[PDB]
Structures are given as structure tokens and as C-alpha cells.
Amino acid sequence: KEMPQPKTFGELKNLPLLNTDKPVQALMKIADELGEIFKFEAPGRVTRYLSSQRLIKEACDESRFDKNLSQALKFVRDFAGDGLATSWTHEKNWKKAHNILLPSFSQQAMKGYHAMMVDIAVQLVQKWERLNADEHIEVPEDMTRLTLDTIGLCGFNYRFNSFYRDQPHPFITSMVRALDEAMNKLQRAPAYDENKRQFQEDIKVMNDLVDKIIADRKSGEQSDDLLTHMLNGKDPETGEPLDDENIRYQIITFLIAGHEVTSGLLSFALYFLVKNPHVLQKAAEEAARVLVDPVPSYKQVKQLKYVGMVLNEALRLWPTAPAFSLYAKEDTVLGGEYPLEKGDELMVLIPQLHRDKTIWGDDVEEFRPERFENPSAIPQHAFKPFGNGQRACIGQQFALHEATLVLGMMLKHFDFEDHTNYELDIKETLTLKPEGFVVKAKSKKIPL
Amino acid sequence: KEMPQPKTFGELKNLPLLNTDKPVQALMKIADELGEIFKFEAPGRVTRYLSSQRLIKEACDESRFDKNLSQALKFVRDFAGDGLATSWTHEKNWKKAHNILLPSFSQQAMKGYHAMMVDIAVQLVQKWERLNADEHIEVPEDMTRLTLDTIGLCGFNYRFNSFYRDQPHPFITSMVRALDEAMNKLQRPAYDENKRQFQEDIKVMNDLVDKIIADRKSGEQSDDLLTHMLNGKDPETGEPLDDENIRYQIITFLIAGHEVTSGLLSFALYFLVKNPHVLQKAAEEAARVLVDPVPSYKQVKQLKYVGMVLNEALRLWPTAPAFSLYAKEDTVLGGEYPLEKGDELMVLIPQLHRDKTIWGDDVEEFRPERFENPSAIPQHAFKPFGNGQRACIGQQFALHEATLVLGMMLKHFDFEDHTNYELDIKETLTLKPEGFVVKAKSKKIPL
Ligand code: HEM
Ligand code: HEM
Ligand SMILES: *N[C@@H](Cc1ccccc1)C(=O)O
Ligand SMILES: *N[C@@H](Cc1ccccc1)C(=O)O
Ligand SMILES: *N[C@@H](Cc1ccccc1)C(=O)O
Ligand SMILES: *N[C@@H](Cc1ccccc1)C(=O)O
């Protein structure tokens, strides 16, 4: 009944614990000492970090808990607005955009996005086959190039052409810097006057590009992208279409939730593959037996079951969206021993949930894709890499299909060597990525 | 591209080849002569028996192949009904019962069954320590007593009390006889008596099970499969299983439980006493882990090598020796065998597990160390529990029960193959080593 709490720092309480370049991993270490739940206190804020399936399965009860905007999401809201990810459930614009955007994110809608995904996937395979001998691949940098171009091509029919650059796009320079400042606000309290001047200067860069792209599209030209469905799609409930401001926030949202959070999955997947040669060969075998054409089809991607198992296990150990927030709708008791008042907040520490030994056994730290041989064997609310309930990831099928195609083509065309014996170092922005992860790719000389 | 086929018998085609008391072993011998695939033809039926991991990994593609009811499963359906094992994937009651029964068969649900499994496991250990000198154990008969009592106690809180009997329960008297008739119809006024007895055997099973369902509905609750089915509702449709289907699930769980699982223990003990080094390695682990008079659920999960012994025994002699599949659409198998929509396939599991390209040249050797790393095992090479969504739902149940009991057996007894048993596999719908007997000299470790 008495909830533990980590070390305090006087008037700042537990806030200095977040003053670190790896906060998610720090909360994971705190969870190992304190267990399934611990109270976290800051000046003006209190939250409870959940780590066990026993309690998270209760927090996922939508009749008792709703999505809360964490302090990180409130800072992203300053440029993501009332987009799908940074809006409240009770706000009119969430349910409106949710109803309009569900058909464009279905598994059957991935058939229309497949050709543009293959476009960017071919550019990645061609870059790696044009490398010289002893040259290495910067894995997270190249995965971000692919993911960002994929969502740009599939979402707005816009080509960032990341494979033609070493310096990033002027849009994401402002974006990644706005995400950095938003994360740096997490552990605060004239000195930061420059930060604020740069923050609004970075917000205007994102708004002007998207609003110009929206105004340019509105030629009347159609396409198979997210952009067309938002100009002509109407919410069945209210009958209304999204206004011009909201569509801008959705595009910014899809670009953030697109590029490196999805690429982190590919980077972690490739890392765990080259660290487990048995799994690598088994996944490479499936890529060769299934992808029999120079260009993979939509059906062939769906046949890569073991590649999806590899992607699901990489999401287990290192989910790139490492947590989400919930608040109590009413007075309730959590786990029969932790009474919660209305409005009290919860945190779902996803990497810890996926390390519940009572769910996955003693071998939680091993990269074993065979845990996902049969999805019905996994308990309820034990695997939550994409959120929960109606507030779950709407682009889950987008990210999984894109990652399955690219990983299958990567395993089909290249042998991969961990030439540096990479020591895992997880860089923490708002997401997780293996910093400095490099590999060598000996081509298999299979043409496209 | 041209598919081989064994010898034919005129208008009967290959059917007389099945007129034998060991058809699975006979089909295994045909695979050794004909290879990874051969056509099998009967009047009104044709199927293709797959034997290699190369082709079976394709047959396991659920987007291209679905579970088919083999001619044996069609005959079992006359009393197993639309239960989980004898229903088609498209029948509404399969997915309905599948959704309702998945949580009750989870690995976390084995914690609730553990105490009742230890109850029957202790009765087995006490019977064996109460034997007199020079008395031997009838291994498959005693393993069947344990597995039948386990599923009855864990599934319906009913005690068959098999260790208090010499003649089996009247329910399974009709059940084993109905399985005999169902298998003998496969290779068959002359049989008029069989049908009269067959309907008499079905009525005995239906009336008994329906009485237990009506008796439970006392209002009493429990941690058994029966309670999970009376109060559980399918999340998809919102509906609960009706009473006729619940009867079929209980009949299903009684068949698919005891004698398929008891074969695993009998084969496991056989392979243990034929390989004393493996026997000693597993007996050492049982002593190293089971430090309590009663094993806990946590301790069973730590019997890693015992599980390898159980997995290797399932490799050589899987007790559910095959399953059936049909092509959902026109497809090509292996790039050389074109199949039309609806064409049937057979997965000869004991042959699949003897693929030298997967397990090496020592396929016939009992090496439990093959399963040290499941990621080292190729895809769809080890299929003792079926495939995909139609896989064994009691997989958990059977492995935990067999690991607990086998661990207690190795901890409490030294085992001697006093007759130097010659393996003789009796074939009903499953496989078991007939006449396998051993001596168990107790270690005098109390409970
Ligand atoms: C590996 C890839 C991804 C992971 C692990 C992931 C994870 C998540 C998680 C955990 C949430 C819940 C956030 C919360 O509850 O506060 C979420 C929501 C969301 N994600 Fe993703 N995501 C991924 C890729 C994508 C992609 C490709 C898109 C493309 C548009 C996307 C767009 C969104 C949106 C719009 C939401 C908010 C949905 C709503 O609340 O209505 N994400 N994601
Ligand atoms: C050594 C023990 C066991 C083995 C080798 C085994 C094997 C199998 C196999 C191969 C199948 C697939 C049948 C097919 O595809 O046509 C299956 C299905 C099934 N088994 Fe088992 N089994 C065992 C124990 C059990 C136990 C203890 C139960 C307890 C209820 C059980 C219940 C079932 C059920 C209900 C199905 C049908 C599942 C479905 O299709 O939805 N089995 N089993
Ligand atoms: N996103 C999680 C973890 C986190 C804590 C502190 C800084 C960054 C990320 C949360 O907000 O609690
Ligand atoms: N990830 C958490 C971290 C945090 C906790 C408490 C105060 C500030 C930040 C979050 O999203 O807020
Ligand atoms: N269950 C297998 C093997 C078998 C063949 C003939 C009679 C009994 C069992 C199958 O049905 O093909
Ligand atoms: N076990 C098989 C045996 C069989 C195959 C082909 C024709 C007749 C019988 C089965 O259950 O069908």
C-alpha cells in the first residue's frame, strides 16, 4: 500500500534524476530496485511509474483510465498542436481526425502505400550496393533517411531526397531542434532567452513549409497519400472536414512519429540480428525463400512471418516510443492496494513491462524472436509497443509494413558483419536509438 | 515435378497399404523409399504426404493452407462434434471456443492447475514406492492413469481415481472403443455390429458428460476448464458457448489429453533408460532443482534439461503423428508441384523430424541437446503440436504436466530396464510403446 520513491534532492524532489542524457534507461534502473510501481515527484507534479503487466493491464482499462498528456507531450504540443498524438480524447478535433484517418491507416490501405515504400527501399539497397570495399554503413543515419523519405512520399507526395544529402533537410533541422528543446524543458526549474527565440523560429519553419505544401496541393491534384484524404475526407459523426490548421498539425505529427522512432526499430532490429547469428540466418533464409521477385509485392511482405517476429522482439527489448501517460477518470484502487484519486496520473514504462519475468520467464534479456511464433500465446496487455486502446498507434500497420519490407530486402541482398563489435549505446531524444552503430554489408550480387 | 506414388491394388489404389496395425510406421517406410513427397490415392480421396522441412515450411503458410479434417478426424467428429480439434477454421464455433479457452490454457494459467497436477503426480510416486521387491511397472498404463486423472481433475474437478482401479473408467471404455472403430473405418451388414456399438459408445459419452455439465450448473465455481466455459463469453461475438458444444470440448479434452500426453511420458522414459548418460544428466537436474518435497510451479520451469528430454522424445515419436492441410487457392508447392484449390496435404511429423538436412546424420539418436537453442532450429522443422492458429491449445498443459511428473520420477527412483525392452509401437490414433516395463528402486526420499 505504501508506494516506494527514489532518492530526492531537497526542494526539487526527484527532478534532478531526469537531468541526464539517458532518462528512460535511468527509470528502468530505478524500476529494478523498487519494483512494479514507484512514485515520482517534481515541483508541481506527481506521477507513478508502472512496470508490471499486473498493474498495466488495469491502467489499460479505458473505463477507468484515459490517455494523459505527459509533460513531454505538452511541450511537443507547442508545434504538434491538437494533432492525433498531442490531443485530449475529449477534444473535438481528436475524434474528428481519428475517424477521418482510420481508413487511410488500415492494413488494406497499405496496398496503396506499398509502391512508394518500395521506391525508398530500393534507394536504400542501391546506396549500400554502391559502397566501396571496407566502407561501412551508419545504420541509424541510413534508417532515418529511409523512414523520413517513406512518410514524406507516402504521406504528402513530397521527396525529402535524404539519400542525396549528408546535411539534413531544412525542415527537420528545425524539427529535431524543436524536439531537443522540448526534451530539455523536461528537467527545468533570462538565461534561456535564446532558446525561446530559436524555438519559435523553428516552429515557423515547420508551419510555413507544411502550410505551403497544403496550399500548393489545394491544383486539385489527387494521389494515394495521407494529404488527399484529409482535404476531401469528412468525419461521419460531425459531417465536417478537418480545417487547414489541423491538417498542418497532423502532417507535423506524422513526420515526427515517422522518421526516427520507426527507424529506431530497424536500427535495433539490425543490431540484434548481427548480435545473434542464428536468428540472422533464420531471418535471411525466409527473405530468400519469400522475396522471389526483383521488387517485393504486398503479399510477399505479408509472408515474412519470421521477419515480423524479429521486429516484434526488437520492440519488446527496446520500444522506440518508450512510454505513454494515463490519468484516472474517477477515484479507483490500483492493484487492490494503491488507491488513486480522480485525475491522478500514471506512467507505463514500456521497456520494463516487456521485461516482466512473470510473463516472459527468466530469459527476458535474450533476443528470442520465437516468443512470437503464435500471437495468441502472449497474455493480455503484456506487449504494448504501440500504446493502448483507442489512443494506440494509428500508424502501426504503416510502420510494421515499411519495416518488414525494408528488413526483408536488407536480409535478401546483403550479408552483414559487426566489424567493430559494436558496444550498445542508446542515445535518448524523445525516442531511443543505438548511437554510432555501424556494420559492413557484403553484397550478394542479386539484381533489382 | 512428377509426384511418386507407392504400389497400387487395382480399383482400391493404395488403400490396402493402410490395412495394417501400424500404418504410421508403414507410411514412414514409404517416405524413406519415395522421399519428401508422394501421392496417396483411395476411392474418392487423394492426399499428398509431406516429409521434408523444405516443403512443410510452405504448407505451414496459413495464407496459403488451412487445417483440413483428415478422414480420421472426420470419423472422430461423430463424437467430438464441432470441438476445437474436429471443427473447420471457418465454423463459427471454433473461433468462438478458441477465444474463450485461450486464457485458461496460458502458461500463467498453469499456476492454478499446478496443485491439482501435483496431487495426481504424488499418487503416482506413492504407488511406485509401495511396490514390493522384484515387482515391475507397466509404464504406458501408469502414465495413462496419471494423465487421465490430471485432465479430469484440472478440467472438470472430477476424479477418475485411476490408481484405485484395474479396469478403466466406463466413459473411456466407450471412448477408446470409439477411437478403435474410427481408425478401423479408415482402411475398410459385415460391420453392422460396429455401428450399433458405435452409437452405444457415443451415447455413453454424451450422457455422462452432459450429466457433469448439468451437475456443475450447484452453482459451484472452481479453477477448472468447466468453470471457464460456463461463465466465459467470447469477446468477438459477446456470446457464450452453448451446452452442446461444451460437451464436445470436454470429450475433446479427455481424448486429446490423456493418451496423446501419456505417450510422451512413456516414450520419454523409454529413451531415458536406453541412454544412461542422458538419464543421469536429467536425474542430476531433478535432484539439483527439486529441493522441496513438493515441486513448485517455479521449480518445474527450472527443469530445463527435462524439457529438452521431452522435446527430443516428441521429435523421434510425436504422439499426434500428423495433421492435415488443404490449399486455400491455386498454388505451387516447392516450385515443381502445382496444387489446385482444395487439394489435400499430409504432414508426416515423425518423418519431418528425421530430415537429415535439419538434424544431421544422427537423426535416430536421442540427443536432447539439440534443443539448447530454439533459434538454432530452422523454421517449421519441429512441429509436434501442429501449426499456426490450429496448433495444440493444451501444449502448455501437456508440457508442464509431463515436466513436473518426469522430474519427480527422476528425483525419487533409479530405473532399470530389466527386460531390455524391444521397442514395439502400438498404433491406435496415437503412438505408444506397448509392453514397456521397468523396475524402479526407490531412493527413499520422503514427500
Ligand atoms: C516503430 C514505430 C512506432 C512506434 C513504436 C510507435 C508507438 C506509438 C505509441 C506508444 C503511441 C501511443 C502514444 C500515447 O499513448 O501517448 C503512438 C501513437 C501515435 N502514433 Fe506511433 N509509433 C510508431 C510509428 C508511427 C508511425 C509510422 C506513424 C505514422 C503516422 C505514427 C503516428 C502515430 C499517431 C498519429 C499516434 C496518435 C494516435 C492517437 O492517439 O489518436 N506512429 N505511437
Ligand atoms: C504430448 C502431448 C500432445 C501432443 C503431441 C499434441 C498434439 C497436437 C497436434 C499435432 C494438434 C494439431 C491437430 C491438427 O492440426 O489437426 C493438436 C491440437 C489440439 N490439441 Fe493437442 N497435443 C497434446 C496434448 C494436448 C492436451 C494436454 C490438450 C488439452 C486440452 C490438447 C488439446 C488439443 C486441442 C483442443 C487441439 C485443437 C486446437 C484447435 O485446433 O483449435 N492436446 N494437438
Ligand atoms: N517519456 C518518459 C520517459 C522520460 C523521462 C524523462 C525525460 C525523457 C523521457 C516520460 O516522460 O516519463
Ligand atoms: N517522461 C516523463 C518525465 C517527467 C516526469 C515528471 C516531470 C517531468 C517530466 C514525462 O513525460 O513527463
Ligand atoms: N493419422 C495419419 C496416419 C494414419 C494413416 C492411416 C490410419 C491411421 C493413421 C493419417 O490419417 O494419414
Ligand atoms: N490418416 C489419414 C489416412 C488416409 C489418407 C488418405 C486416404 C485415406 C486415409 C487420414 O486420416 O485420412
Short mmCIF file of N, CA and C in Angstrom, two decimals, chain A residues 278-279 282 286 289 303 305-306 358 367-370 374 376, chain B residues 57 61 63 98 102 111 373-379 388-389:
data_model
loop_
_atom_site.label_atom_id
_atom_site.label_comp_id
_atom_site.label_asym_id
_atom_site.label_seq_id
_atom_site.Cartn_x
_atom_site.Cartn_y
_atom_site.Cartn_z
N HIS A 278 22.43 -16.93 -35.27
CA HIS A 278 21.42 -17.95 -35.54
C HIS A 278 20.12 -17.31 -36.00
N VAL A 279 19.68 -16.26 -35.31
CA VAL A 279 18.48 -15.54 -35.72
C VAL A 279 18.68 -14.87 -37.07
N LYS A 282 18.33 -17.43 -39.89
CA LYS A 282 16.95 -17.89 -40.00
C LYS A 282 16.07 -16.83 -40.66
N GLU A 286 14.36 -16.82 -44.67
CA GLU A 286 12.98 -16.52 -45.04
C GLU A 286 12.92 -15.45 -46.12
N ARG A 289 13.62 -17.17 -49.47
CA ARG A 289 12.59 -18.08 -49.95
C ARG A 289 11.29 -17.37 -50.33
N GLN A 303 4.09 -12.39 -46.12
CA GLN A 303 4.57 -13.75 -45.92
C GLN A 303 5.85 -13.81 -45.10
N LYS A 305 6.84 -13.85 -42.05
CA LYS A 305 6.39 -14.01 -40.68
C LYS A 305 7.54 -13.86 -39.69
N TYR A 306 8.67 -14.53 -39.97
CA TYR A 306 9.78 -14.51 -39.02
C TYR A 306 10.43 -13.13 -38.94
N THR A 358 7.47 -12.58 -14.78
CA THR A 358 6.27 -13.39 -14.59
C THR A 358 5.51 -13.62 -15.89
N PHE A 367 17.47 -12.00 -26.98
CA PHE A 367 16.76 -11.67 -28.21
C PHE A 367 16.29 -12.98 -28.82
N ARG A 368 15.06 -13.36 -28.48
CA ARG A 368 14.46 -14.62 -28.90
C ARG A 368 13.19 -14.32 -29.68
N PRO A 369 13.28 -14.17 -31.01
CA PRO A 369 12.07 -13.91 -31.80
C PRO A 369 11.03 -15.01 -31.73
N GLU A 370 11.42 -16.23 -31.34
CA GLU A 370 10.48 -17.34 -31.24
C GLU A 370 9.45 -17.16 -30.13
N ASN A 374 3.46 -17.68 -32.09
CA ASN A 374 2.00 -17.70 -32.09
C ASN A 374 1.52 -16.51 -31.27
N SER A 376 -1.35 -15.69 -30.16
CA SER A 376 -2.37 -15.98 -29.16
C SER A 376 -1.79 -16.43 -27.82
N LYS B 57 7.53 -26.29 -44.50
CA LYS B 57 7.57 -24.87 -44.15
C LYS B 57 6.68 -24.05 -45.08
N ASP B 61 2.28 -22.17 -44.30
CA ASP B 61 1.83 -20.82 -44.64
C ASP B 61 0.31 -20.77 -44.52
N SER B 63 -1.67 -18.27 -44.98
CA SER B 63 -2.29 -17.53 -46.07
C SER B 63 -2.52 -18.40 -47.30
N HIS B 98 -12.23 -20.95 -29.37
CA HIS B 98 -10.81 -20.61 -29.31
C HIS B 98 -10.58 -19.36 -28.47
N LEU B 102 -8.54 -19.75 -24.73
CA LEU B 102 -7.13 -19.37 -24.76
C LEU B 102 -6.57 -18.97 -23.41
N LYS B 111 -0.26 -21.99 -13.30
CA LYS B 111 -0.07 -21.78 -11.87
C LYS B 111 -1.28 -22.26 -11.09
N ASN B 373 19.08 -24.39 -28.03
CA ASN B 373 18.77 -23.09 -28.61
C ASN B 373 17.64 -23.22 -29.61
N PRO B 374 16.44 -22.71 -29.31
CA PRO B 374 15.35 -22.78 -30.29
C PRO B 374 15.61 -21.92 -31.51
N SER B 375 16.43 -20.87 -31.39
CA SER B 375 16.76 -20.04 -32.54
C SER B 375 17.72 -20.75 -33.48
N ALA B 376 18.42 -21.78 -33.00
CA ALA B 376 19.28 -22.58 -33.87
C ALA B 376 18.48 -23.57 -34.70
N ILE B 377 17.24 -23.83 -34.31
CA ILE B 377 16.39 -24.78 -35.05
C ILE B 377 15.74 -24.04 -36.22
N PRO B 378 15.81 -24.58 -37.43
CA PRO B 378 15.21 -23.88 -38.58
C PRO B 378 13.70 -23.78 -38.44
N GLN B 379 13.11 -22.96 -39.30
CA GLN B 379 11.69 -22.68 -39.21
C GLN B 379 10.86 -23.87 -39.69
N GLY B 388 0.35 -22.99 -36.51
CA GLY B 388 -0.43 -21.76 -36.60
C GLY B 388 -1.54 -21.67 -35.57
N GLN B 389 -2.62 -21.01 -35.96
CA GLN B 389 -3.77 -20.83 -35.07
C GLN B 389 -4.47 -22.15 -34.76
#
